[PDB]
Every structure is written in C-alpha cells, then in structure tokens.
Design a protein around this ligand. Structure first.
Ligand SMILES: Cc1cc2nc3c(=O)[nH]c(=O)nc-3n(C[C@H](O)[C@H](O)[C@H](O)COP(=O)(O)OP(=O)(O)OC[C@H]3O[C@@H](n4cnc5c(N)ncnc54)[C@H](O)[C@@H]3O)c2cc1C
Ligand SMILES: Nc1nc2c(c(=O)[nH]1)N[C@H]1C(S)=C(S)[C@@H](COP(=O)(O)O)O[C@H]1N2
Ligand SMILES: CC(C)(C)COc1ccc(-n2cc(C(=O)O)cn2)cc1C#N
Ligand code: MOS
Ligand code: MOS
Ligand code: FES
Ligand code: FES
Ligand SMILES: [Ca+2]
Ligand SMILES: [Ca+2]
Lengths: 1299, 50, 99, 50
C-alpha cells in the first residue's frame, strides 16, 4: 500500500511517504521543482493550476486525457496516473509546442501568470480532438481566468487550430503534428495488466485508503462509518482548506468498477456514483443525438445545467455521487434529479435499495437520507415519457463557472394527449437551506389545465410558498423570488410550445423559450503600418510581441514565489483582526506554539525601528492597542512550512472589546468622519447657470468598488544578510522605492542598507502601487528577527480582504440644461469610501474631480470631494485612479439630459463636446483634441445609425428580450497628480562584446514596458533588439523611482533611456568616424581600448506641470489620451443575464510604439471596465466583514464575457509631439470605455420598462453600478416583480392613507 | 598564495534567456562574466557577477 | 575588497569630497550590473583609480545640489537632498577616471 | 562566498583532474561514480553548449 507511484512529464515518481493532504500543485512546486504551474486561488475557479492527466481506463480499454486543477487534486488519487504540466509539452530551451507558440505570437500573453493554465487547457483539448471547432475551443476555457488580455487575442490565436497590417501571421505557425506528442508511459501500460490492490497512505493528520473493490469499500464503511469518501475532492478540498474541517480518515472508491459503470436500461441510463460529470455529459449528449426527442427531456435538462457547471477541469474530476451527497442548497443537479424522480441505488454491507429522489431525500441542511454505513452506488436518469416535458434553468452573477443564485428542475406530466396536469414538480436550489419542492403550489394544479389561469395561480403560489426573510443568507431577496416566478413563466411558455406539436404562441413571446445560444465571433484590429522606408531593425511602431511571452507560455518565466527557497528559508502567515473596530485586550499563542514547525509569533513589540508606516504615516506595521478594520494586521506567525504557519496563525487567540464602528459612506457623513478637508473645483457662475436653464435634474448615484484580482497575489521574499542591517528583498510590487524606504523605516536603518529587486509581477493594476508593503514590511521584520530568509505569498482570500481595492463612490448631482440638450450648470458632490488610512485616497479624488467633465464643456460647474474615513481595509489605486468613477457619474447625468430632452443621446453628447482649443473646468487648454475624429470614425465603422434601427425593430418583435446601443467618448489626463513624481532615470551599460544591458526605474507587470524600452533603445542606438536586454528593476541601479503608475512609464522611462543612448552615441562618435565601415562591436571595443566609459545614466523630467486647487490654475497634465466606444447588448428581461453583442473602439494613442501591445492594453482595460460596471461586486456584512473573498463569489470577466464582435482601431495620423517618438500613454485611458456596455444595458432596460412598466417616455430610473443581473432584472419591472414585491406587498396594506 | 579563503563560486541559473547570477571570490568580475558567457555561448549582458 | 581596505578608503574619500560623515555612506558589494568593464582589482592602483572615479561622481552630486544649498545655506544635507528630489533633479551618477 | 546560504535544491560540484603531467585521455569510466549515493552527473567537454 504505502508507496504512491505516478508519472510527471514521462518521469516516474515514487513517493514513499505520501500525505493525503498534499495537493498536486504543492507537490509539483515544492517537491519536483516544476514551478510552471501556478497558484491563483486555491479554490478551483481560476485554472492557473491547470495540468493534464492521462490514464489507462480499464472499462473502456483506452488511454484517456483530461484536464484538472492541481490545487484540488490530492496526489493520493493519482496512483498510476500520468501528469503533464506546461514544462512537459515544450520550452524555449528546447522547442515550443504549437499551443505555446501561438498564444505567444498572437499576443495572448501579457503578465503571463495565467498562460500556463490556459496553455494546458488548450493542449488537453487538442490531445482529445486535434481538429476542434471554434465552439469546443471557447468551451475549453470555462475554468480559466485572465485579467490582462481581454481574452480576444487568446481565442483568435487558438482559432487557427480549427478545421491595414495584421497583429500576427498564422502562416508562420508550426503545424500541429500529433505523431510527435509524448507517448503514454510504457511502464504504466504494463501495470495495467496487474489487478488493483487496496492502498493505504498515512499523513501528519490523515489516513487515506484507496479501495479497489466494492466489497472492500463496504467493509471499510461498516468499520469506519465516519470516514469521508473522496473522489474529485472538489467539495472536501474546499471544506479542508477553507472551512476549518478535518477528516482523519478518507476512503477513495474511484477505482471500483461498479461505481464507474454505465448501463442503458428500459427506464433510463444508469451511472455509477463515481462517474465524472464530463462522462455523464458525453453519454447524455450521445443519447440526445440518437434517441427520439420525446424520450430525452430529462437528459436535455441535465445537459443544460452541466453547460454552466464549473469548468472542464472540475467537471472532469467531479463525480455524480459527490454532488448529490454533498447536498448543497445550491446544487444545480439535485433539483433536476428531484424533479425527474431520478432513481438512487443505495448500498451497505449486506443491504441494497433503490429509491426515487423526492423532497424527503434532503431532510435538513447538508444531509441526505443515507445511513452512516451506506454509500451511493449508482443513479438512473429516466427517459421522459409521452406527454411529459422537462426544463432546467440556472441564473447566477456570471454565466460561466458561477454559483447559482437560483437553479431549478421542472417537470410536468399530462393525461394522455391532453393539456390536463397529471403530475407537476417544481424543484429549486438557492431558495432555502436545501433543495426544495414547491409541493403546496404544485399539488393545487393536479387535474387542472395548462392555461393562463394556471400560470397566475402558480406564480401567486410560489410568491407565498417560496418566501425569504429580509435576513436570508446571500441577500438579493427580491431578485431570487422574481427568478423563481420567472423560471416558471419560461417553463410555462416552453410547455405550451412543446404541446403545440410542431414535430398559437405570440411571436413576441417565442424568444422567452429559447435556451442560451452562442453567436459566432468576429474580431478586427486596425492600426497604421510604419513608413515604407523604415529599417527592419527599427521596431518602433511594429507589432513586436512581448519579449517574455514565449517564456510565460512555457512556464519558464520566474515570478516571486517561483524563486527557489533557501534550505533555511521560513514561511510567514499574517494574523489579522476579525473585528472592524475594537481594543486588543490580549493575545494568546499557547495553542499556536503547539503546532509542529512553529517558530514564533511576531507583533508590534518586536519592531526594532518604527511601527508607523503608510504613505502618510497613517498606519501601524502591526496593530497596537486597537484594530480598525477586519483584516487589520495584528502580527504574524513564522513556521517551517506554509501549512504549519497557517494552522498556527489560525489558532492564535485574540480577545477583543468592540468599539463603535463607521462602515459605510452614509455612516461617515452622518458622523462627520473624513480625511482632511473638502476638495473643490469651481468655474463660472452656478447661481446664474441654473437661472438660464430650461430644465433641472438632480439625483444620487452609487458605483461599487473593485478587487484588482491580479492572477499573482502579493508576495515578498526577504533575505537578511547579517551585516550592517543589510537586507535584499524580491517583491511583486510597482513601487520598489517605497518598499525600500518603508522597510528601512521599520528596521531603523539607513535606506542605503536595503535592496529591492523586482523581476516582474503577474499583474498589478494599481493594487501593488503601495499596498504591497503590508506584506513586504511584515516579511522583512520576520527575516530581521529570525536571521533567516523568509517569504509570504498571500492566498486569494487573504489578498481580497487585506490589500484594498478601487474606491466605492457616492455622488449627489444637479444639472441644468436647455431643451436642446446643451448643459449650462452642473454641481456634483463626490464621496469615496477610503478605508482605515489615507494612502492614495486624496490624489484619487483629485483625479476624479479632474474628470467630472469627461469630454463636455460646462460653462458653470462646481465639483466637491470628500474622503470618508471608515473601518474597512484601506482602499487604494486601481487602473483609472478615480477617473472611471467621475467619468461614470458624468455620463449618467448626460444620459438623463438626453432622455429628459427627448433627443438622441449621441446628438446631445456631440453638441456639448469640447472643441479644439477649449479650456477644461480646471482651465487647461485642450490641444490636439482628437475626440471628434474618434467619434466620427467610430460612428462610421460601427454603422451606429443603421444598427440603431435594427435595435428598435428587435425590441418591437421581442417582449422578454431587449437590445441597447450606446456610444461614449472619453479623455484621460496624462501625468501623476503629484508634479515631482513625473521624473525617471535609466542606467545603461555596453559590455565589450557589444551587448547592452538596460536598466530603468519602471517595473513590468504585463503591460510590456520593458519590451517598449528595448524597442526604444534599439531605435535610438540603431542596432537590433537582439543586442539589448533588460533583466530586472532594482533600487541599486536606479534610485528614487516613482511607482510604475499613472500610465506614464513608457513616456518618462522611454525618454530617460533615449537620453542615455544619446550619451552612448556621443562617446562612440570618434571611433565611428575613424572606422566608418566598422561594426557596432568594432566601435565598442575601440572605445573600451581607448578608455572611454561605456556606462551612463539617463534622466527625464516632464516639463511645465503644477496645478493648484486653490487658484484653479496651472497645468495638471502634459496631454490627454482620447477614445470612443460603441457597444450593443441584449438583455434577458426575465433573468437579468445579457449578451455583449458588439463593441467598436477607436482609440488615440498617437503614433503607437507597438500597436500589438497598445491594442492589448485597450482590450484589456476595456474588459476590466466591463467588469467594474457589469459583473464585479464585493459584498460586506453590516458589521464590515467582506463576504466575497474568492473567484467563486467575485466574478471578473470570463472568456465568454467579451463582446462577440470585438473591433478595435488605433487612430491614424495623430502624432503626439508631447511624448517619446510621438506616442501616448495607453494603460488606463481605455478602461472607462467599458461603460459603453453599462449604458447600452440601461438603454435596453428602458425598452423593457416601456414594454411592461410605465408609459412615461421621460422617466428617469436610477441604475447604480455595477449593473449586475440582479439590478438588470429588478429594473425590468413587470407582473412578476410586482407579485414578489419586497416590503408590505399584497400582504400588508396600510389602515389609512392621506387623500 | 595561500589566501585563507580558497577559490569559491556559487552559480544560480535563472532559466530565462540564458540568465545566470554568480557569487564569486574573485578580483576579476569582468573576465569571470565574459568567460562564463563565452563558455555558455550567450551575450555578456545575460551574466551577472557579484 | 580582499582585505586591503579598498572600500574603507573609498568611503573615506567620498566622505571628504561630499563633506558629510562616513556614517552616511555605504559600500555593499561589487557587481557587473552597476559598474561594467572593470579592470581586475590589481596592480596596487585601485585606490588611485577608483578613488578618482568616486571623487568625480561626488563632484557631479555636489554640483546638482549647489542651487539648493545656496537657496537654503543653513539647511542640512538631508534638506538639500530632499529639495533636489522634489525639484526632480537626479541624485544618481557615474564617475570615471583614466590615468 | 561559502557563508551564503544554499538553496534547498542547490547541488555541489567536485573537479575531476588529471593525475598525469602529459598524456592522451584514452577513455573515462564513471560506472563506479554513478554508484555513490547522491550522484547526479559527470560533466565533461562535450557538455559545453558554447
Ligand atoms: C470551481 C468550482 C465550481 C463548482 N461549481 C458547481 C456548480 O456549478 N454546481 C454544483 O452543483 N456544484 C458545483 N461545485 C461543487 C462540486 O464540484 C460538486 O458538488 C461535485 O460533483 C462534487 O463531487 P466530488 O467528486 O469532487 O466530491 P468530493 O469532494 O470527492 O465529495 C463530496 C462529498 O460526497 C461524499 N461522496 C462522494 N461519493 C459518494 C458516494 N458514492 N456515496 C456516498 N457519499 C459520497 C463525500 O463523502 C463528501 O461528503 C463546484 C466546485 C468548485 C471547486
Ligand atoms: N497586463 C497588465 N496591464 C496593465 C497593468 C497590469 O498590472 N497588467 N496596470 C495598469 C495600470 S493601473 C497602469 S497605471 C499602467 C502602468 O504602465 P505603464 O505606465 O507602463 O503604461 O498599465 C496598466 N496596464
Ligand atoms: C506624499 C507622497 C509623495 C508620499 C504621495 O505618494 C503618491 C501620491 C500620488 C501617487 N499617484 C498620482 C497618480 C495619478 O495621478 O494617476 C497615480 N499615483 C503616487 C504616490 C506614490 N508613491
Ligand atoms: O497608476 Mo495604475 O498603478 S492605477
Ligand atoms: O596585481 Mo595583485 O592582484 S599580484
Ligand atoms: S489555483 Fe487552482 S483553480 Fe485557481
Ligand atoms: S496575461 Fe492572463 S492574467 Fe495576466
Ligand atoms: Ca488588492
Ligand atoms: Ca485609503
């Protein structure tokens, strides 16, 4: 038993002491040295840990390949399995596999942290189908997340596997040749002829038994009824890792043939309880294609759910039995099995029984009617009968890989050939602490006929029977009740249709019965070709792929945690506050000290220097006397392994004494809790403006926050030297300078003693501009105290809780305008929730105020800003830095002005638009204002007007689906709000072989900064990029660097590098003239031989900057970046889901240094904006505790979230004389354009309200951001939303009412 | 010479673009760098000697 | 550094040229990514040549700080350095010497 | 140099040198070395990439 034997990339692994708790991911990274597979969430929702598994399937007598999340796969389930990681299919050292080459060359890799996982998902698909369809390709990534790319390039590049210049050339791609793929390990194929034997594995706390026969399993269960069975571990893994659970004994029955058998019987198809969901799906699909439609109603329902069930990785390991027995309130399958009466065969030693699943199978929360000694053997999904119809629906926050808000299974059996109900079952998930059946409601319809009266009776019944208390877990009470009725309506209409034979229903109702249908994708990227005579060696302006893309696709690119640990390196786990505001009465570490490997607990008293930190000396390194937010760092545990540090930290006991807390913006205003005084920009005569206005509109608006969700979380490695307080740190941060000074401040040593090195970040987006120090300083202290190197990489839940995010904003506005739509007055008061420290909050509000105008000239305007001081983690910078919030507020009132005026939105926007030479509200002249060009070109290329007609027609022909169209412009001021941060340095060395090493103050986080700098240096020096190299960013090469932020890195570091190159050229001049026909190498050696230094610095300072909020004068920015976007969507008025049909973008990035990288920045930023405004939402309890701490609950855009038709164009002939080689900053500017989707959605909602709500064409309904399915569905007021009501429905009518 | 500390080198291969970082007991970081690059067949800018 | 006290002498030199205590100066190591194409530390001329290169680099620093010193004569080295930083003046430079 | 901590996966190298003042290398046999516990590999001229 004991010995665990499996293979990794063809190599045999013999683990003599396998611990049941060890996951494949940990084993790969910590034991085998294969760091290409990454940790991104540890909960199965990001796919960064994706690998391929291959095994000989005895029942099928065939080699099967499937993908799996290494973070949830126990190595103990892998005996005799062959694992294939990213490093197993190719590399830059040998040869890249077609999959790796294409994602790299097609620009599908930016920061690169998600690339290996996506590479393996694609690779697995190809091993199963060398010639996949476009749909199969998209579906391969239901379980993979990317935060940088916007997905389009990944899909477009992989699309080549199916069956204006271009960003890439498919013709240069190496063809896929399956004959050259690694062979299945011969040794494993031999072991197949050796009958299985029971195995036993013993770990630190768990005992694992791999049962080989049904008899052994039953004997084990009789002997150990408490033992938890484990197959896919997609539930148990979560329970162990996140739910503080511990199961001392596990039995894995995955090998048992009876638990994997598939049998086609007269009543249906039977599946062994261990069968993976992917197998069920394949078998059922084949059945639907072969059997008559009338017999596959239930099968069809199962398939529909499986369609939105996790992703390929989870479905390939998740078992049927696991989902049924876990009995989660939100199971997507149990409602279907219950409604269809799916037969369950239950067994124990000496007993056997088969029972149809009904409402009684789930007695209470997380429990089934199985005895402690019984196990689920098989499940028989029934064939549907004549006169029997079935439907299954699921609605969540995001279509792909999400948790159901409400999910259901619905069945109806009519009397032979009639419309008279004989049987009716409506089962729901997400409406109680278990799967339930609306029996009371359905029982009343037996013998009744399928008609309007039944529809009404059922809805009222559901509204009464499926009630939800205001404190119902998960919230969204109104939305969930509405879905329960809406799903039935859909079922009702679908049944009428099915009854309609066809082998009538109002035409405008038909679309309500259609299941989600994918539309073919169409992407186009337009950019300018470089001058005809430009040398091939001059890559500036060419679509040169990210220099590290290939290494990121091969898993060779090193991120912080990938750096090997020293033999004496320890691990750190932060101990954080569980209270929002309270006094720390005591801390007990007695229990933690008992955890094996425990080294020490560190706190404020251990700090040798200062415990005062933060950008404004606002924070503590470690809490002292009081905690001011849940997540507030109190101290840290240091242990020999990450597991031991985590377990020890978990048992540190802190005794609190609660103090009054201020959580919301509303609370802060009421208690007058702000940071500093009011910020304000005022121009013109407000009093006068409102006087000239024909109309006045005032209101309030809210925009939720956002979690950065960089695929790589915060991470720091600190190496104490033991000499003069010296310390060298490897950190995932955009701010090496502050990291260095903060660490030195905490240690009480000179800054010249600290070295900070940054290779690259797997994403930053502002989340690493300052908050990375929370971890860095803690790790530095641990290294100082122990004398050992120490490291810490945050788990996703820690990261989302502690590090802060985008600032939520609350706005109160009042706008005055003329009947023509022209604005004459505007007042806007902004309030942001800043958290428990200042950090970057002030500058963020400044940028917000700087953009409250967007692209419109407002003669009289007043904007104020207040930073709310609250007991929540400190919010910080996030791509946009306050601009998106202010821009969103602006567009909101602009959309209300058009509706109120009854004029076309685009007409109103155009006439209020600035013109070349105008001054902004903060008095800066707009030179080279390109919005007009972007606007006209976008309208044209998007065929806006023509499609505006198509939209109206669709809305007339559809009652429960509506489309919306909206075109929005944007302008973003370029430059740090702090004048002195607009400086940059570079250091360049030319070695005696002619090779050049460039170093600059900027850091790489996936935006392609180093790539652009190499392109710049190559042009300036007039030598091939092949001779230039940038290794990393370090404080001992370029000091006092500003954080890599404000989208100006290319601008300033490009100039610094350029200058350094000029100095080099100047020095080489004498030798070039002496030997004109010589090579670059000849001149360099001659210079060296003549003792001419080949090393120099470069520096740049952005001229004429310095705005003042006191005088509303001075240049705030160096220039502005512009763009326009038009988006069309389709909403499901019954569920809240929606499709992003098409988006056309025209962006002005001047003369792009690299159109491939810039289009990538445009698409990436647009998708993050799309996320901010329509999908991403963080929920907190009333006491201030964050509920959403992982991808399972926080839904960022998925592959399927992007516009089906995605067109991006870079404005031609628009050089920017204000920046390096006439380019423009592109990082943040495009993000707000994502709002075009938000407003298209609101347009669609207006069509829906006009349809079923009011008749007031001038009605202004509020729609806060993000416009999630909850907000979209709730806004589509109808007879269903009305029946559910919310407060004092038809239930409580007041005794009296004023007349 | 009989320097109390004998010759010593630690070589750290990064796995990226031939990069290598070496900690060496030497009075000649320049030749150490070029000689290692020459043996490896990579540009000198890929080698860091400390 | 091989025991001859080269770094010590360079710190002494930098301190004299910059007119600040040695306590504010530090030399951690020698690396090819900070100073390239260096001759081997030999021929007994290290103090001679590197001392000169350090001197020149120090002169460049003093020149960049002069405007701020004259602007605030009674201030400290720290005040001048911070003023220069906030005025976006580079506080990094190379130094070179040739016999 | 040697006081610098070793990485957990850090290996050790031992030079194999000539015991003759001048001679032709006829053959090299590592069959015995391969038996020593912890043996990883023997490197020679042909292993040099540059
Ligand atoms: C990213 C992610 C997304 C997910 N999405 C969804 C979703 O959309 N819808 C949904 O419903 N679920 C979802 N899940 C839950 C999970 O994947 C399913 O519940 C799955 O079928 C669990 O099966 P498993 O084999 O991994 O179970 P395991 O974790 O191996 O076991 C689960 C439980 O079942 C018991 N068990 C297993 N087999 C038997 C048996 N034969 N007899 C008696 N008891 C048994 C165990 O003892 C244990 O209590 C998701 C999970 C993750 C990690
Ligand atoms: N792929 C990727 N792109 C990105 C980021 C990132 O973390 N990953 N950060 C953004 C933010 S918030 C900024 S301010 C810039 C910084 O880069 P730049 O100044 O070089 O353009 O890039 C943007 N683009
Ligand atoms: C007072 C002090 C210098 C410490 C404040 O530090 C900062 C203030 C503002 C910003 N910052 C302005 C923008 C933007 O305008 O986009 C983006 N980031 C960065 C830092 C840093 N580090
Ligand atoms: O300036 Mo970006 O880091 S929000
Ligand atoms: O020049 Mo001394 O190193 S013999
Ligand atoms: S780390 Fe495995 S799914 Fe995210
Ligand atoms: S490239 Fe995918 S997350 Fe960065
Ligand atoms: Ca964060
Ligand atoms: Ca803050």
């Amino acid at each position: 038993a004991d010995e665990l034997v499996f293979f990794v990339n063809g190599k045999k692994v013999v683990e003599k002491n396998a611990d049941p708790e060890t996951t494949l991911l940990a084993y790969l990274r910590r034991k085998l040295g294969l760091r290409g597979t990454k940790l991104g969430c540890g909960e199965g929702g990001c796919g960064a840990c994706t690998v391929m598994l291959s095994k000989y399937d005895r029942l099928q007598d065939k080699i099967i390949h499937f993908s799996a999340n290494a973070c949830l796969a126990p190595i103990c389930t892998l005996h005799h399995v062959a694992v294939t990681t990213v490093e197993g299919i190719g590399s830059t050292k040998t040869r890249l596999h077609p999959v790796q080459e294409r994602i790299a060359k097609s620009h599908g890799s930016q920061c690169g942290f998600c690339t290996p996982g996506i590479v393996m998902s694609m690779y697995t698909l190809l091993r199963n189908q060398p010639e996949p369809t476009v749909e199969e390709i998209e579906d391969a990534f239901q379980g993979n997340l990317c935060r940088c790319t916007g997905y389009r390039p990944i899909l477009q590049g992989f699309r080549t596997f199916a069956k204006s210049p271009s960003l890439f050339n498919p013709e240069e791609f190496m063809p896929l040749d399956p004959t050259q793929e690694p062979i299945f390990p011969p040794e494993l194929l031999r072991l197949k002829d050796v009958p299985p034997k029971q195995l036993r594995f013993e770990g630190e706390r768990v005992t694992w038994i791999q049962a080989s026969t049904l008899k052994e399993l039953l004997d084990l269960k009789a002997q150990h009824p408490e033992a938890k069975l484990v197959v896919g571990n997609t539930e148990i893994g979560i329970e162990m890792k996140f739910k503080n659970q511990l199961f001392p004994m596990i039995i894995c029955p995955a090998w048992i043939p009876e638990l994997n058998a598939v049998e086609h019987g007269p009543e249906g198809i039977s599946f062994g309880a261990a069968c993976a969901l992917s197998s069920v799906e394949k078998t059922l699909l084949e059945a639907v294609a072969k059997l008559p439609t009338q017999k596959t109603e239930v099968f069809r329902g199962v398939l529909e759910q499986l369609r939105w069930f996790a992703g390929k990785q989870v479905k390939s390991v998740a078992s049927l039995g696991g989902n049924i027995i876990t009995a989660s309130p939100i199971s997507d399958l149990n409602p279907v099995f219950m409604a269809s009466g799916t037969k369950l065969t239950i067994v124990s030693r000496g007993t056997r029984r088969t029972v149809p699943m009904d409402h009684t199978f789930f007695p209470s929360y997380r429990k089934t009617l199985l005895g402690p000694e019984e196990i689920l053997l098989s499940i028989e999904i029934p064939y549907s009968r004549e006169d029997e119809f079935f439907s299954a629906f699921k609605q969540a926050s995001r279509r792909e890989d999400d948790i159901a808000k409400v999910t259901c299974g619905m069945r109806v059996l009519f009397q032979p050939g009639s419309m008279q109900v004989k049987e009716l079952a409506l089962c729901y998930g997400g409406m109680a602490d278990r799967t339930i059946s609306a029996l009371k409601t359905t029982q009343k319809q037996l013998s009744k006929f399928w008609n309007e009266k039944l529809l009404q009776d059922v809805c009222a019944g559901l509204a009464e029977e499926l009630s939800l208390s205001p404190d119902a877990p998960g919230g969204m009470i109104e939305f969930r009740r509405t879905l329960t009725l809406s799903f039935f309506f859909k079922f009702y209409l679908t049944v009428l249709k099915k009854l309609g034979k066809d082998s009538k229903l109002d035409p405008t109702y038909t679309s309500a019965t259609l299941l989600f249908q994918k539309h073919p994708p169409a992407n186009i990227q337009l950019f300018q070709e470089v001058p005809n005579g430009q040398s091939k060696e001059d890559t500036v302006g060419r679509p040169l792929p990210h220099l590290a893309a290939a290494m990121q696709a091969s898993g060779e690119a090193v991120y912080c945690d990938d750096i090997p640990r020293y033999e004496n390196e320890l691990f750190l786990r932060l101990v954080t506050s569980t209270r929002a505001h309270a006094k720390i009465k005591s801390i007990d570490v007695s229990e933690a000290q008992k955890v094996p490997g425990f080294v020490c607990f560190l706190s404020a008293d251990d700090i040798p220097g200062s415990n005062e930190t933060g950008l404004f000396n606002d924070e503590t390194v470690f809490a002292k006397d009081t905690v001011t937010c849940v997540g507030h760092i109190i101290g840290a545990v240091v242990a020999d392994t990450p597991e031991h540090a985590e377990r020890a930290a978990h048992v540190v006991k802190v005794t609190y004494e609660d103090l009054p807390a201020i959580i919301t913006i509303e609370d802060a205003i009421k208690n007058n809790s702000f940071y500093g005084s009011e910020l304000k920009i005022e121009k013109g005569d407000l009093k006068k403006g409102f006087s000239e206005a024909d109309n006045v509109v005032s209101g309030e608006l809210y925009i939720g926050g956002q979690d950065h969700f960089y695929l790589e979380t915060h991470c720091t490695i600190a190496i104490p030297k033991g000499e003069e307080g010296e310390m060298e740190l490897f950190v995932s941060t955009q701010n090496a300078m502050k990291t260095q000074s903060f660490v030195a401040k905490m240690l009480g040593v000179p800054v010249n003693r600290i070295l900070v090195r940054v290779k690259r970040m797997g994403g930053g987006f502002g989340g690493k501009e300052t908050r990375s120090t929370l971890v860095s300083v803690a790790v530095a202290l641990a290294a100082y105290k122990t004398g050992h190197p120490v490291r810490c990489m945050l788990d996703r839940n820690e990261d989302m809780l502690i590090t802060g995010g985008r600032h939520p904003f609350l706005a109160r506005y009042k706008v005055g305008f003329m009947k023509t739509g022209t604005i004459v007055a505007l007042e806007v008061d902004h309030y942001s929730n800043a958290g428990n420290s200042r950090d970057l909050s002030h500058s963020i509000m400044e940028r917000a105020l700087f953009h409250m105008d967007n692209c419109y000239k407002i003669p009289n305007i007043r904007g104020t800003g207040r930073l709310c001081k609250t007991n929540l983690s400190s919010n910080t910078a996030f791509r946009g830095f306050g601009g998106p919030q202010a821009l969103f507020i602006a567009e909101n009132w602009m959309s209300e002005v058009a509706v109120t005026c009854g004029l076309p939105a685009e007409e109103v926007r155009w006439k209020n638009m600035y013109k070349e030479g105008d001054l902004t509200h903060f008095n800066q002249r707009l030179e080279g204002f390109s919005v007009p060009r972007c606007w006209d070109e976008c309208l044209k290329s998007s065929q806006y007007y023509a499609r505006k007609s198509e939209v109206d027609k669709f809305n007339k022909e559809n009652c429960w689906k509506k489309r919306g169209l909206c075109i929005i412009p944007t302008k973003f001021g370029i430059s740090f709000t702090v004048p002195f941060l607009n400086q940059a340095g570079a250091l360049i060395h030319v070695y005696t072989d002619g090779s050049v090493l460039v170093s600059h103050g900027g850091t790489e986080m996936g935006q392609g900064l180093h790539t652009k700098m190499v392109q710049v240096a190559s042009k300036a020096l007039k030598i091939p990029i092949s001779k230039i190299y940038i290794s990393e960013t370090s404080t001992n090469t370029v000091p006092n660097s500003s954080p890599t932020a404000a989208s100006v890195s290319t601008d300033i570091y490009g100039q610094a590098v350029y200058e350094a190159c000029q100095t080099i050229l100047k020095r080489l001049e004498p030798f070039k003239k002496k030997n004109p026909d010589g090579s670059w190498e000849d001149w360099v050696m001659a210079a060296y031989q003549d003792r001419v230094s080949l090393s120099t610095t470069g520096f740049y300072r952005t001229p004429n900057l310095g705005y003042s909020f006191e005088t509303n004068s001075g240049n705030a920015f160096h220039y502005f970046t512009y763009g326009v976007a038009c988006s069309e969507v389709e909403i499901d008025c019954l569920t809240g889901d929606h499709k992003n049909l098409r988006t056309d973008i025209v962006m002005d990035v001047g003369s792009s240094l690299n159109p491939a990288i810039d289009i990538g920045q445009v698409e990436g930023a647009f998708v993050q904006g799309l996320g901010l405004f329509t999908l991403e939402e963080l929920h907190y309890s009333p006491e201030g505790s964050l509920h959403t701490r992982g991808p399972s609950t926080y839904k960022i855009p998925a592959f399927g979230s992007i516009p089906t038709e995605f067109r991006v164009s870079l404005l031609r002939d628009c050089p920017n004389k204000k920046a390096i080689y006439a380019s423009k900053a592109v990082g943040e500017p495009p993000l707000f354009l994502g709002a075009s989707v938000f407003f298209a959605i609101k347009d669609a909602i207006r069509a829906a309200r006009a349809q079923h709500t009011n008749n007031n064409t001038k009605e202004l309904f509020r729609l806060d951001s993000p416009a999630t399915p909850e907000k979209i569905r709730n806004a589509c007021v109808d007879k269903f939303t009305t029946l559910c009501v919310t407060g004092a429905p038809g239930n409580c009518k007041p005794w009296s009412l004023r007349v």
